[PDB]
Amino acid sequence: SYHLDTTAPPPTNLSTLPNNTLFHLWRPRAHILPAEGQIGDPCAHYTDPSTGLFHVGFLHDGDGIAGATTANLATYTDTSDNGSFLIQPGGKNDPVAVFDGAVIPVGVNNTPTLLYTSVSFLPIHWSIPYTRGSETQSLAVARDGGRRFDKLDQGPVIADHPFAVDVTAFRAPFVFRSARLDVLLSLDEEVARNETAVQQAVDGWTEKNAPWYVAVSGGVHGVGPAQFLYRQNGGNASEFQYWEYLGEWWQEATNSSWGDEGTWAGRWGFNFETGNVLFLTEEGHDPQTGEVFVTLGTEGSGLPIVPQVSSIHDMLWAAGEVGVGSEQEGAKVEFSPSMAGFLDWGFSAYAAAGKVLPASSAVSKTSGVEVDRYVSFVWLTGDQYEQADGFPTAQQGWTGSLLLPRELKVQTVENVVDNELVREEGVSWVVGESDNQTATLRTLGITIARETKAALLANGSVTAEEDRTLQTAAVVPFAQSPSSKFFVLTAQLEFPASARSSPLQSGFEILASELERTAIYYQFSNESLVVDRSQTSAAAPTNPGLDSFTESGKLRLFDVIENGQEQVETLDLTVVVDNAVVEVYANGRFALSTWARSWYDNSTQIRFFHNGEGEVQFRNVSVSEGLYNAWPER
């Protein structure tokens, strides 16, 4: 008989092992996931007005939305056992399934109200004909603190997609408020043209009584992906039954992309999924003074297309401005991207679902945060969106996980030499100011939620490494490596201006022993942070289910003036390893997550890495081991 021994070689076929045998092998301890089973898209988050607690939601086992709550954003508690479900299919509006949805804190009966996609027909896919009535948007109300959502005893409040529009997908309603949208809509078509008159109205805007907007994601057959915008009828904040259609406030031509070569923001693909609408400043979230930001997943494919197969799942973001609808008979308001990028460059990262976290929340009160924040939760599919080549699912007993909660805001990059590196077309940043000599850049800021980061390094063991410089090729083991696979690695890599043209590759090797290693390094050839997983798992060679393809993201290191002197901006790294869940963060303006399913208990070594091409200076290298338990009650 075979009992799991991770100090010994892995069996050739993991899929032959007994159920639940691999349950803990690759399981994270500081991440959001159900007690067992599979987790899908994150949805339905809301900061309970009454208790100030923050509720988190996610599709679970493809049988509905499950929930959990937190008071500090560090630890979570399941709403209930047996799946901890909030709402499941089988109603009159959702006889087949319950898809993503979002919550209005003070809705029907003045309680948290869920607006979600109720499904009545399958299959549903952008590459095939759409069955009329497949997806409708229904309402459900929170009961018993929010441990359950009861569907309203009536049909959907948005019972059909736009009239006679051949949509590719009509789902994932996301609710939000906006001063600019209210102003542009409450104005005149001629008076809402001059930003002056407009801006003057936004100043007196009052959030408390503003109407809600709903953004539904999808696209149109033969046209392109799009976001369908609605709002409480007539701008009536008390109107929850009728939702007026404002049109396709954002659409792109089929498989087109941001930029001439789709370099910084993947492609718009064939269908938009899970549109989140944000309003960011330089400190957090503000629906009155914040710039419009939209995060979304796009479904793509190579040609020839294989019906019912989305080969590419990009987790994108875009920022821009909202204006009136021109002079055409189309959308009443329109979103125009000025810049776009990736919220996470991970192949398996997708469906980021976020929510405003008020400073008045119990979470922010405890941590002492004085501003409103926007926390986003990204999905890390466990099996490559179910296209994996025989992953040992029954053996693991669970599938997928959410990534660490992330704060999103406008991040600025100061003292940037205004050169070609900054003026390139179709990038993920805009210039905030400049004298043609140095400029301030503006882009999406991405950082681990502060309380979560604090919890990750509150009881961790700290081991630093001496600053180091590598010129010739070398792989240097740390003075002391962690003895577990639960740690946070931080480091700063400084490169010479001369490395830009070089074939330089510099980083670290982690989760390493003689038979295994995972490499993380910066590459100038394509200005990308890369995660080489070719040798990650000693079990991958005979178990194709464990993907081992290379992961990478674009990260441009600008020329800056740090000390009255020019230099290539410092690569500020933060790698969080929560067993197999690996999250690479950089300069607060970059995230790449993936699975690193190493097998041996001894694969915990960490080494400096340099390919000899060019030179690199490592500074402030440190390792915090341990992380923490995100689910105390389990």
Ligand X SMILES: OC[C@H]1O[C@@](CO)(OC[C@@]2(OC[C@@]3(O[C@H]4O[C@H](CO)[C@@H](O)[C@H](O)[C@H]4O)O[C@H](CO)[C@@H](O)[C@@H]3O)O[C@H](CO)[C@@H](O)[C@@H]2O)[C@@H](O)[C@@H]1O
The pair phi, psi for residue 380, each rounded to 5°, is: -120, 90
d(CA 264, CA 341): 6
Size of the site for ligand X (CB under 6 A): 21
Minimum distance between the CB of residue 158 and ligand X, rounded to whole angstroms?
15
Minimum distance between the CB of residue 385 and ligand X, rounded to whole angstroms?
5
Minimum distance between the CB of residue 274 and ligand X, rounded to whole angstroms?
6
Which run of H or E residues covers position 116?
strand 113-119
Q: Which is nearer to ligand X, 120 or 594 (CB)?
A: 120
Q: What is the DSSP string of 485-504?
A: SEEEEEEEEE--GGGSSS--
Site pattern 338..377 for ligand X (x: CB under 6 A): ------------xx--------------------------
Asked if 417 is part of the footprint of ligand X (rule: CB under 6 A), the reply reads no
Q: Which is nearer to ligand X, 104 or 351 (CB)?
A: 351
- Contact segment (CB under 6 A) with ligand X among 18-26, 94-102, 507-515, 524-532 equals 94-102
How many residues in total does the chain contain?
634
In the 3-class helix/strand/coil scheme, how is 150-219 assigned residue by residue?
A: EECCCCCCECCCCCCCCEEEEEEEEEECCHHHHHHHHCCCCCCCCHHHHHHHHCCCCHHHCCCEEEEEEE
d(CA 559, CA 566): 7
Asked if 314 is part of the footprint of ligand X (rule: CB under 6 A), the reply reads no
- Contact segment (CB under 6 A) with ligand X among 166-174, 206-214, 475-483, 566-574 equals 166-174
Label residue 68 exposed, middle or buried (CB < 10 Å: 0-12, 13-18, 19+).
buried
SS3 134: coil
Q: Which is nearer to ligand X, 98 or 573 (CB)?
A: 98
d(CA 446, CA 261): 24
Q: Which of 172, 280, 455, 606 binds ligand X (CB under 6 A)?
A: 172
Q: Which of 9, 18, 35, 122 binds ligand X (CB under 6 A)?
A: 122
Asked if 456 is part of the footprint of ligand X (rule: CB under 6 A), the reply reads no
* Closest by Cα among 464, 113, 124, 426 to 261: 426
Q: Which is nearer to ligand X, 41 or 547 (CB)?
A: 41
Asked if 33 is part of the footprint of ligand X (rule: CB under 6 A), the reply reads no
Instruction: Please report, as a single letter, which amino acid is at residue 448.
Output: I
Asked if 282 is part of the footprint of ligand X (rule: CB under 6 A), the reply reads no
Asked if 301 is part of the footprint of ligand X (rule: CB under 6 A), the reply reads no
Q: Which is nearer to ligand X, 320 or 400 (CB)?
A: 400
Q: Which is nearer to ligand X, 249 or 272 (CB)?
A: 272
Minimum distance between the CB of residue 428 and ligand X, rounded to whole angstroms?
23
Q: 326-358: b or e for each residue (b if 16 or more CB lie within 10 Å)?
A: eeeeebbbbbebebbbbbbbbbbbbbbbbbbbb
Asked if 59 is part of the footprint of ligand X (rule: CB under 6 A), the reply reads yes
Asked if 62 is part of the footprint of ligand X (rule: CB under 6 A), the reply reads yes
Q: 507-520: b or e for each residue (b if 16 or more CB lie within 10 Å)?
A: bbbbbbbeebbbbb
Asked if 402 is part of the footprint of ligand X (rule: CB under 6 A), the reply reads no
342's tokens:
């990736």
- Contact segment (CB under 6 A) with ligand X among 87-95, 165-173, 198-206, 499-507 equals 165-173
Asked if 60 is part of the footprint of ligand X (rule: CB under 6 A), the reply reads no
Asked if 274 is part of the footprint of ligand X (rule: CB under 6 A), the reply reads yes
Q: Please report, for the chain, how many H helices and E strands are present, in that order.
A: 6, 40
623's tokens:
């390792």
Q: Which is nearer to ligand X, 167 or 172 (CB)?
A: 172
Label residue 190 exposed, middle or buried (CB < 10 Å: 0-12, 13-18, 19+).
exposed
Q: Which is nearer to ligand X, 124 or 416 (CB)?
A: 124
Other Cβ atoms closer than 10 A to 626:
19
Q: Which is nearer to ligand X, 95 or 123 (CB)?
A: 123
Q: Which of 49, 91, 111, 125 binds ligand X (CB under 6 A)?
A: 125
Asked if 331 is part of the footprint of ligand X (rule: CB under 6 A), the reply reads no
Q: Is 370 left (phi over 0), alpha (psi -120 to 50) or beta?
A: alpha
Asked if 94 is part of the footprint of ligand X (rule: CB under 6 A), the reply reads no
Site pattern 380..399 for ligand X (x: CB under 6 A): -----xx-------------
Asked if 605 is part of the footprint of ligand X (rule: CB under 6 A), the reply reads no
Q: Which of 94, 252, 273, 372 binds ligand X (CB under 6 A)?
A: 273
Q: Which of 41, 182, 372, 418 binds ligand X (CB under 6 A)?
A: 41
Asked if 40 is part of the footprint of ligand X (rule: CB under 6 A), the reply reads yes
Cβ atoms of 243 and 69 closer than 8 Å? no
* Closest by Cα among 19, 617, 39 to 377: 39
d(CA 54, CA 381): 23
Q: 479-491: b or e for each residue (b if 16 or more CB lie within 10 Å)?
A: eebbeebbbbbbb
Minimum distance between the CB of residue 313 and ligand X, rounded to whole angstroms?
7
Site pattern 520..539 for ligand X (x: CB under 6 A): --------------------
630's tokens:
């995100």
Asked if 102 is part of the footprint of ligand X (rule: CB under 6 A), the reply reads no
Q: Which of 18, 90, 123, 477 binds ligand X (CB under 6 A)?
A: 123
Asked if 310 is part of the footprint of ligand X (rule: CB under 6 A), the reply reads yes
* Closest by Cα among 581, 357, 547, 329 to 450: 357
Measured CA distances, 431 to 278, 371, 437 (Å)? 20, 25, 12
Minimum distance between the CB of residue 296 and ligand X, rounded to whole angstroms?
10
Asked if 225 is part of the footprint of ligand X (rule: CB under 6 A), the reply reads no
Asked if 100 is part of the footprint of ligand X (rule: CB under 6 A), the reply reads yes
Asked if 97 is part of the footprint of ligand X (rule: CB under 6 A), the reply reads yes
The footprint of ligand X (CB under 6 A) covers 40-41, 59, 62, 97, 99-100, 122-125, 169, 171-172, 273-274, 310, 350-351, 385-386
